[PDB]
């Protein structure tokens, strides 16, 4: 389906599968599995855009791509 590469400042590159129409929250749950960072403390970026957890990757323009590169930041929420 779709392969997601998640790069971060702290950990090795993460790889896992995703669906472009699922919420970004589903990505964060994969990150939580690999890093144990709770979903509420993660921020994901596509390019330089911060993704909102309720939105889908498709809504940010992920259409035909077979592989995408995301950035993870660990952030204490307000």
Author numbering: 4 to 81
From the paper:
FAT10 is the only UBL modifier to directly target proteins for proteasomal degradation independently of Ub attachment. At the very C-terminus FAT10 carries a di-Gly motif that is a hallmark for the covalent attachment of Ub family modifiers to substrates through a conserved enzyme cascade. To characterize the structures of the FAT10 domains in more detail, we crystallized the N-domain and solved the solution NMR structure of the C-domain, since we could not obtain crystals of the latter. Both domains adopt the typical ββαββαβ β-grasp UBL fold.
To improve the long-term stability of the wild-type (WT) human FAT10 protein, we replaced the four cysteines in FAT10 with Ser, Thr, or Leu depending on whether they were predicted by bioinformatics analysis to be solvent-exposed or buried (C7T and C9T in the N-domain; C134L and C162S in the C-domain). The N-domain crystallized readily and we solved its structure at 1.95 Å resolution by molecular replacement. As in Ub, the core of the UBL fold is stabilized by a dense hydrophobic interaction network that is almost void of aromatic residues. Overall, comparison of the FAT10 N-domain structure with Ub showed that not only the structured regions are well-conserved, but also the lengths of the loops except for the α2–β5 loop that contains two additional residues in the N-domain. Interestingly, the hydrophobic patch in Ub (L8, I44, and V70) that is used for most Ub–protein interactions, is neither conserved in the FAT10 N-domain (E15, L51, and K79) nor in the C-domain (S95, T133, and A159). To compare the FAT10 N- and C-domains in more detail and to identify conserved regions, we generated a multiple sequence alignment of FAT10 proteins. This revealed a conserved surface in the FAT10 N-domain that mainly consisted of the β5 strand.
